């Protein structure tokens, strides 16, 4: 078709946030449950 373009695109900022954010709940995943292991900081 031929209608509204969205010249703008910081679409990427969202996926970027999600990925740079999901990487957090990653380091954690390992410590869930009676088989979860502790972290040493």
């Amino acid at each position: 078709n031929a209608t509204f373009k969205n010249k703008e695109k910081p679409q990427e900022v969202r996926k970027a946030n999600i990925i740079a954010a999901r990487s957090v709940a990653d380091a954690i995943r390992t410590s869930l449950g009676p088989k979860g292991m502790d972290k040493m900081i």
Binding site: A27, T30, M37, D38, K39, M40, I41
Partner: protein, 66 residues
């Protein structure tokens, strides 16, 4: 010991330690090699308390200092 704990019966004789000065197995209770129970009882219960808190370590995040 592996044997002694076979009727542990005959004349059970653990307390058999090492006599490194000579290089042979002797009865340490006789020989005079005594150590308080309270030591090897805490020396053990303790050393594991460490090993475990470390056995659980799977990721070591080291923050940058100042």
């Amino acid at each position: 010991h592996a044997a002694s704990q076979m009727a542990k019966k005959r004349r059970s004789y653990r307390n058999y330690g090492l006599d490194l000065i000579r290089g042979k197995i002797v009865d340490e209770i006789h020989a005079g090699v005594l150590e308080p129970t309270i030591s090897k009882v805490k020396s053990l219960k303790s050393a594991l308390e460490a090993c475990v808190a470390i056995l659980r370590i799977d990721t070591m995040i080291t923050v940058d200092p100042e």
